[PDB]
Amino acid sequence: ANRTLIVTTILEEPYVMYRKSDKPLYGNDRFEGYCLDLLKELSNILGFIYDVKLVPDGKYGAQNDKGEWNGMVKELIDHRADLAVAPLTITYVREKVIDFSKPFMTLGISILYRKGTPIDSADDLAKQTKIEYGAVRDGSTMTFFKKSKISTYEKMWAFMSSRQQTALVRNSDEGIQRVLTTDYALLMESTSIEYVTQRNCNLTQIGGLIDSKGYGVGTPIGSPYRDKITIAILQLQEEGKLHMMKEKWWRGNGC
């Protein structure tokens, strides 16, 4: 009409999940989560309708050695989506190829590991080999270590990229499973660490935030919607709604 916006996203708890129901669920009704509530509110403010699709390869997006992007980032580059509404990290390398709204949530890389060990920081992980560590393949944390010029992070990258078949995981669910079943520490964004540690009293963040950043809504470069989505996010912040959405999905999870 009124064209239907195509939204690309990625299943990731509590941001985007399949809703569980006894009755059959069709289309957007199949999904729930922080990012779906946010999408609803954005569409309430900006007056659009949308069709939610998953990223075909189930990846956030990274650029390979040939310079090629994948994941949700590539979906925007190739104009197969109008918006990525996902816990999608705003980074300088991504900003060269796609546009981002202002952040709807802030976070930094930290460490997820079990409690009760002498590991207090990234340095404690870097100076040893017994405890394996790593990150989600082709996300921004993996890229942060790959591009880092800080020694300890450089040393950590050499370790994870040499052990990449085991050290790099396909998604955060696998990384948490590795932390649970095996001797492994996950480099993970702090908002997700928070979600996990609230649900398993054996797990903890180790050390503080290794960087500081945000999740934003992605659009193709030059999109007219990017600024409009910023304005809508600023209204939700002003209304306290970003706070209530976070509380809803983190502490009192679900509907």
Q: Which residues are annotated as a binding site?
A: 87, 89, 94, 140-141, 189
Spatial CA neighbour of 89 closest among 79, 69, 77, 103: 103
What's CA 5's distance to the chain center, in Å? Answer: 21
Residue 37 interacts with ligand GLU (CB under 6 A)? no
What's CA 33's distance to the chain center, in Å? Answer: 13
> Applying CB under 6 A, which part among 74-82, 136-144, 193-201, 225-233 lies near ligand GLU?
136-144
Phi–psi pair at 2, nearest 5 degrees: 35, 70
Spatial CA neighbour of 210 closest among 188, 229, 240: 188
Using CB under 6 A, which of 63, 140, 191, 223 touches ligand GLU?
140
- Looking at beta carbons only, is 192 or 223 nearer to ligand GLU? 192
> Applying CB under 6 A, which part among 123-131, 139-147, 219-227, 237-245 lies near ligand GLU?
139-147
Residue 99 interacts with ligand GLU (CB under 6 A)? no
Helical residues (DSSP H) of the chain, grouped into ranges: 34-46, 71-77, 92-95, 122-126, 140-147, 151-162, 164-167, 172-181, 190-197, 225-238, 241-250
Judge whether 25 and 19 are in contact, CB under 8 Å. yes
Using CB under 6 A, which of 14, 87, 216, 218 touches ligand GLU?
87
User: Cα 146–140–78 angle (5° rounding)?
Assistant: 110
- Looking at beta carbons only, is 60 or 113 nearer to ligand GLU? 60
Contact track, ligand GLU, 154-173, x by CB under 6 A? --------------------
- Looking at beta carbons only, is 33 or 139 nearer to ligand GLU? 139
Query: Would you tell me which residues interact with ligand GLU (CB under 6 A)?
Result: 60, 87-89, 135-136, 139-142, 188-189
